[PDB]
Design an enzyme around this catalytic site. Sequence first.
Site, PDB file in Angstrom:
ATOM      1  N   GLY A  42       0.822  -1.179   0.000  1.00  0.00           N
ATOM      2  CA  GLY A  42       0.000   0.000   0.000  1.00  0.00           C
ATOM      3  C   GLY A  42       0.853   1.223   0.000  1.00  0.00           C
ATOM      4  O   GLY A  42       0.363   2.307   0.221  1.00  0.00           O
ATOM      5  N   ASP A  95       0.146   7.888  -7.463  1.00  0.00           N
ATOM      6  CA  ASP A  95       1.336   7.104  -7.275  1.00  0.00           C
ATOM      7  C   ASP A  95       2.564   7.628  -8.009  1.00  0.00           C
ATOM      8  O   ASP A  95       3.561   8.059  -7.398  1.00  0.00           O
ATOM      9  CB  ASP A  95       1.047   5.633  -7.591  1.00  0.00           C
ATOM     10  CG  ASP A  95       0.073   5.039  -6.619  1.00  0.00           C
ATOM     11  OD1 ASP A  95      -0.356   5.635  -5.633  1.00  0.00           O
ATOM     12  OD2 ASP A  95      -0.253   3.811  -6.943  1.00  0.00           O
ATOM     13  N   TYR A 123     -10.779  -3.636  -7.276  1.00  0.00           N
ATOM     14  CA  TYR A 123     -10.341  -2.337  -7.735  1.00  0.00           C
ATOM     15  C   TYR A 123     -10.994  -1.841  -9.006  1.00  0.00           C
ATOM     16  O   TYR A 123     -11.597  -0.790  -8.980  1.00  0.00           O
ATOM     17  CB  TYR A 123      -8.818  -2.239  -7.801  1.00  0.00           C
ATOM     18  CG  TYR A 123      -8.272  -0.841  -7.983  1.00  0.00           C
ATOM     19  CD1 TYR A 123      -7.603  -0.183  -6.945  1.00  0.00           C
ATOM     20  CD2 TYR A 123      -8.329  -0.211  -9.228  1.00  0.00           C
ATOM     21  CE1 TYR A 123      -7.047   1.089  -7.126  1.00  0.00           C
ATOM     22  CE2 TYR A 123      -7.747   1.043  -9.432  1.00  0.00           C
ATOM     23  CZ  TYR A 123      -7.119   1.705  -8.380  1.00  0.00           C
ATOM     24  OH  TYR A 123      -6.578   2.951  -8.604  1.00  0.00           O
TER      25      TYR A 123
HETATM   26  N1  LIG Z   1      11.208  -4.314  -6.828  1.00  0.00           N
HETATM   27  C1  LIG Z   1      10.294  -5.000  -7.329  1.00  0.00           C
HETATM   28  N2  LIG Z   1      10.574  -6.191  -7.917  1.00  0.00           N
HETATM   29  C2  LIG Z   1       9.669  -7.037  -8.504  1.00  0.00           C
HETATM   30  N3  LIG Z   1       8.404  -6.782  -8.579  1.00  0.00           N
HETATM   31  C3  LIG Z   1       8.090  -5.597  -8.015  1.00  0.00           C
HETATM   32  C4  LIG Z   1       8.928  -4.689  -7.409  1.00  0.00           C
HETATM   33  N4  LIG Z   1       8.217  -3.577  -6.962  1.00  0.00           N
HETATM   34  C5  LIG Z   1       6.948  -3.863  -7.315  1.00  0.00           C
HETATM   35  N5  LIG Z   1       6.841  -5.042  -7.995  1.00  0.00           N
HETATM   36  C6  LIG Z   1       5.706  -5.630  -8.660  1.00  0.00           C
HETATM   37  O1  LIG Z   1       4.677  -4.766  -8.473  1.00  0.00           O
HETATM   38  C7  LIG Z   1       3.753  -5.332  -7.513  1.00  0.00           C
HETATM   39  C8  LIG Z   1       3.262  -4.233  -6.610  1.00  0.00           C
HETATM   40  O2  LIG Z   1       1.985  -4.641  -6.125  1.00  0.00           O
HETATM   41  P1  LIG Z   1       0.828  -3.548  -6.139  1.00  0.00           P
HETATM   42  O3  LIG Z   1      -0.429  -4.235  -6.561  1.00  0.00           O
HETATM   43  O4  LIG Z   1       1.133  -2.414  -7.080  1.00  0.00           O
HETATM   44  O5  LIG Z   1       0.716  -3.001  -4.642  1.00  0.00           O
HETATM   45  P2  LIG Z   1       1.579  -1.847  -3.980  1.00  0.00           P
HETATM   46  O6  LIG Z   1       2.033  -0.980  -5.123  1.00  0.00           O
HETATM   47  O7  LIG Z   1       2.758  -2.398  -3.198  1.00  0.00           O
HETATM   48  N6  LIG Z   1       0.635  -1.001  -3.032  1.00  0.00           N
HETATM   49  P3  LIG Z   1      -0.392   0.108  -3.503  1.00  0.00           P
HETATM   50  O8  LIG Z   1       0.337   1.530  -3.447  1.00  0.00           O
HETATM   51  O9  LIG Z   1      -1.633   0.039  -2.630  1.00  0.00           O
HETATM   52  O10 LIG Z   1      -0.716  -0.166  -4.941  1.00  0.00           O
HETATM   53  C9  LIG Z   1       4.477  -6.492  -6.841  1.00  0.00           C
HETATM   54  O11 LIG Z   1       3.559  -7.495  -6.383  1.00  0.00           O
HETATM   55  C10 LIG Z   1       5.302  -6.950  -8.019  1.00  0.00           C
HETATM   56  O12 LIG Z   1       4.487  -7.732  -8.917  1.00  0.00           O
HETATM   57  O1  LIG Z   2      -6.112   5.852  -3.425  1.00  0.00           O
HETATM   58  C1  LIG Z   2      -6.113   4.465  -3.736  1.00  0.00           C
HETATM   59  C2  LIG Z   2      -4.961   4.194  -4.690  1.00  0.00           C
HETATM   60  O2  LIG Z   2      -5.131   2.842  -5.117  1.00  0.00           O
HETATM   61  C3  LIG Z   2      -3.985   2.380  -5.836  1.00  0.00           C
HETATM   62  O3  LIG Z   2      -2.890   2.557  -4.942  1.00  0.00           O
HETATM   63  C4  LIG Z   2      -3.788   3.273  -7.074  1.00  0.00           C
HETATM   64  O4  LIG Z   2      -2.597   3.030  -7.837  1.00  0.00           O
HETATM   65  C5  LIG Z   2      -3.725   4.723  -6.709  1.00  0.00           C
HETATM   66  O5  LIG Z   2      -3.742   5.403  -7.950  1.00  0.00           O
HETATM   67  C6  LIG Z   2      -4.968   5.076  -5.934  1.00  0.00           C
HETATM   68  O6  LIG Z   2      -6.107   4.757  -6.722  1.00  0.00           O
HETATM   69 MG   LIG Z   3       0.273   0.168  -6.737  1.00  0.00          MG
END
Ligand SMILES: Nc1ncnc2c1ncn2[C@@H]1O[C@H](COP(=O)(O)OP(=O)(O)NP(=O)(O)O)[C@@H](O)[C@H]1O
Ligand SMILES: OC[C@H]1O[C@H](O)[C@H](O)[C@@H](O)[C@H]1O
Ligand SMILES: [Mg+2]
Lengths: 391, 390
Positions: free
Chosen positions: B137, B185, B234
């Site tokens: 997150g 983001d 989502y």
């Molecule tokens: N350094 C990294 N190496 C490999 N995969 C990565 C890396 N950083 C992010 N990822 C990929 O991107 C995904 C990020 O998950 P994601 O659904 O975007 O949640 P989040 O970005 O951690 N949290 P949120 O800000 O709520 O979206 C990981 O599960 C990987 O598939």
């Molecule tokens: O605020 C909730 C947040 O959900 C994910 O993290 C999305 O990438 C962001 O753009 C925003 O929608």
């Molecule tokens: Mg994300």
Amino acid sequence: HHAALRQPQVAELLAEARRAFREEFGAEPELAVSAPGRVNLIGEHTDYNQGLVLPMALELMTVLVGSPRKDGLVSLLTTSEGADEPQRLQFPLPTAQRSLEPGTPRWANYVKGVIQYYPAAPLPGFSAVVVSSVPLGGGLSSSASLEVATYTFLQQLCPDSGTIAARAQVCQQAEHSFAGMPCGIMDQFISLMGQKGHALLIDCRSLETSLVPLSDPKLAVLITNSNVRHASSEYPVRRRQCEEVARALGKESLREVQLEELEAARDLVSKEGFRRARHVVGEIRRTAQAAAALRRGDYRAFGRLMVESHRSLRDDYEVSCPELDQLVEAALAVPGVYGSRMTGGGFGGCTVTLLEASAAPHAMRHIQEHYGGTATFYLSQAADGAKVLCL
Amino acid sequence: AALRQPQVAELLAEARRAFREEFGAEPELAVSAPGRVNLIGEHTDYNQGLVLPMALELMTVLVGSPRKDGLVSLLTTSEGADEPQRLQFPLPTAQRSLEPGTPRWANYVKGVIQYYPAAPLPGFSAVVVSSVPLGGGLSSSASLEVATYTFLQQLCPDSGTIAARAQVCQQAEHSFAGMPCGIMDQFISLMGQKGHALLIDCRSLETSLVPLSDPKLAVLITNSNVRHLASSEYPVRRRQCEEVARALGKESLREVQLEELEAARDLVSKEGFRRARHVVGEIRRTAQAAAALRRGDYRAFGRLMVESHRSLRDDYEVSCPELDQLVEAALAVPGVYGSRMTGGGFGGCTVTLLEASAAPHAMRHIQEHYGGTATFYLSQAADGAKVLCL
Ligand SMILES: Nc1ncnc2c1ncn2[C@@H]1O[C@H](COP(=O)(O)OP(=O)(O)NP(=O)(O)O)[C@@H](O)[C@H]1O
Ligand SMILES: OC[C@H]1O[C@H](O)[C@H](O)[C@@H](O)[C@H]1O
Ligand SMILES: [Mg+2]
Ligand SMILES: Nc1ncnc2c1ncn2[C@@H]1O[C@H](COP(=O)(O)OP(=O)(O)NP(=O)(O)O)[C@@H](O)[C@H]1O
Ligand SMILES: OC[C@H]1O[C@H](O)[C@H](O)[C@@H](O)[C@H]1O
Ligand SMILES: [Mg+2]
């Protein structure tokens, strides 16, 4: 490519710093920092009145390159020809006993300050070479660029704790106390706070800051250096002048004063002071206005505010100069030009001009040809702030 | 006790390491992209709302080098990642167009590639490192895309706007990762500035810096270490929001007012009434909190954060038990101004605002009452993407 058109490159700049250093010191430098200068789009002389300002950082900047010293001494060099003789200076660190003194060369007054105030500790001794693309005394804050650049280097020497604002505060004091120039906060900040393809609308009162983008391929920022440098015996005076007015009006600042309200103390404040105040008061609003015009994309409405600004600064504040006025006039004469005004301190220096990029070139000649002086031209874009360069 | 966050230095070196390791050589290029915590304004980005994020000192590092070779070969250091951790493949072309497949983690990079605006683009060896929780997150996704991108500008520099780079990464997550995300983001990722939160208008794309420079104040990020991705949900929410707006002949939920919101009650479904209500509500609150903050009303600030959470838990339904457990736990610690889930929801992290003096009790307190294993982070407003010099 005007012939008077300067495109200084940072890669270059470093390389230089690398060379002199190597040459002056006999070895490769350990550290590499750089603080950019800035051009004020609008908002002249509000700074110290808690007004708004709308500068933007440039690619013109100050690069310091050097190494710590077991030695216990401060020894510098300035590759700048615009500086005060000698170009080199060596002096011992201050102590709880001995605390640095503003001496000669005056240029050194800046470094010393930033040294004498640096927050953290303990601070080593150093070898330092000072390279710069910011014309000295050109209205583009060679002052702040220098201070910040110094401070940021020191950070490499001895890391500090604090906020960014603090840093600005530091450099500011150093200017106040060491260089004898009661300035305002603007310069340092934007030197620190800068950011790419963006202008900063800073709140001098609050210190709040907002980003107005400047990423137009059709818009162009032209800075013209008059190459003249007259009345610094003057700055602090205006400063006082206001300070005093605000005083009469039972107000903390002239920020708490309103165009409309000033006409009240007409008989409660000197003529001169009336004029000064007036400029300031209107200038501040003019500033809130132009940021809006800009965000909105009203380059016309923006080119107009600028002009107004110029005039206030000429007539009511009395900080321009025939050269400036001339340079402005010429600019305004070109088609594609939104507006133009003197930037920075005043009494010589540069002007800033908003125009159609495609007009840029014509502007360069018209200007050259109608400016009964040596004009230097910079086709500027908002740059990033103070930053460390890894050798 | 707070997890101590690698400093670029550390992250770098580690990057160095595995690279020298994996490629038999010393890296040519290095760049990092931070992660992010959203103080407020959740789920408001793809409704053209307002958000209040700040970059983290958790980021991603990318150390690599070009390839006359003409291909793209990578490797991630993160365990929380997709198997395989190594992914070679052929550069895209006229005829050849990247195809988001597996590992899924690779999907991110491909996109940033497939879209890099500039050319020509060489080949590459790149090691991926990160102090950001995958799916915490905290945007491990935008922190990546970004670094990638940040990498590619080193391999064939870019001309366009910042907002342009953001749009890239976004399109990548969108078209390639299968995540219809908003703007937040990425922006903050690039936009971030030390000791400042960022008020972004995801309508005007306008943004303003909010000074978070007060020792007595702390931002505590608590990791539930739980992941349910109900990611499925989502794109769903994006819809409802959108539908509604439609019903209301409005461009975006940003065009609706809490007050006008009554009108549609009959116009829209019941559930979809709640979703909008959250959004529409999230935007004003975000607006108010920023002022609060600016103003220094930490107290009010927190009040708004709590409301956000309820909103987030009751109207939008993006919370999670572990999330509500953690918030509830936090709210009970004196010194705490407010707490609430952050990020997309359905797991991950909570962000808490409190008095720096309280951090320790809190941490204890939250752990005690947490029927799981929380990870903590004591966040400081960091800077955006940077180029790393070796
Ligand atoms: N350094 C990294 N190496 C490999 N995969 C990565 C890396 N950083 C992010 N990822 C990929 O991107 C995904 C990020 O998950 P994601 O659904 O975007 O949640 P989040 O970005 O951690 N949290 P949120 O800000 O709520 O979206 C990981 O599960 C990987 O598939
Ligand atoms: O605020 C909730 C947040 O959900 C994910 O993290 C999305 O990438 C962001 O753009 C925003 O929608
Ligand atoms: Mg994300
Ligand atoms: N690179 C440099 N080397 C040596 N001295 C320098 C350097 N840059 C600036 N200085 C010193 O700083 C001074 C600049 O003073 P100042 O009046 O503030 O000009 P300016 O800042 O460039 N113009 P303005 O921004 O309108 O105030 C010079 O006179 C030098 O003493
Ligand atoms: O606006 C005029 C300008 O004059 C000098 O540059 C000062 O350093 C600045 O702070 C500002 O006062
Ligand atoms: Mg100056």
